[PDB]
Amino acid sequence: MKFILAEKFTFDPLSNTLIDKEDSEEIIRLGSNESRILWLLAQRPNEVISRNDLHDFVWREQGFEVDDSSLTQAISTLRKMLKDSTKSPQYVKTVPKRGYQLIARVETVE
DNA sequence: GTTGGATTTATATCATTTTACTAACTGATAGCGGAACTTTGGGAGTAAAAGAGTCTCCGCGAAAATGGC
């Protein structure tokens, strides 16, 4: 289960690797939390997801107990690693009081 | 012993909801003023001659302060 995002990135959650079409050799390392965040965004391409849903699905599976702002820190790190401008979002959008959005094109190879 | 990622605090910027202050419409209602009309209010007048008041009541006594001589 590997994804293509916005016709530019290749995302591997089983290996938590991010690959660029511009930089195929360069594979960037994303933490578990960011990988699970993007994985749920891909599992629901462009339908609005809820902050409780993300905190649950990410940290209820591993039994971790963290505060709500940890989700905000995870999204901030994902934004800095995706080189996505928060002012003009192209990959991840913040829908206030509803959660987040994956506006980029998502394709499922296999 | 350690150290670095992450899992929280720290500070700032952005978005959403509400407040503060506009205007326009709607609908009425009261108040004031004028014109007309009906009612009220004051005044003048009456040409046989007619030419002196009541007024019932009037079942009180003892003492003192007043004129009048």
d(CA A52, C1' B47) / Å? 123
Angle at A71 between CA A31 and CA A88, to 5 degrees: 90
For residue A79, what are its two tokens? 């934004």
Q: Give the start-to-end residue ranges of the domains of chain A.
A: 1-110
d(CA A105, C1' B39) / Å? 97
DSSP A30: -
For residue A10, what are its two tokens? 């290749």
Residue keyed to tokens 């902050």: A51
Q: Which nucleotides of B are covered by protein (CB under 7 A)?
A: 5-10, 14-17
Partners of A95 in the beta sheet? A99
Neighbours of A39 (CB within 10 A): 17
Neighbours of A33 (CB within 10 A): 21
Q: Which residues of A71-95 are buried (b: 16+ CB within 10 A; e: fewer)?
A: beebbeebbeebebeeeebebbbee
Hey, what amino acid is at A54? L
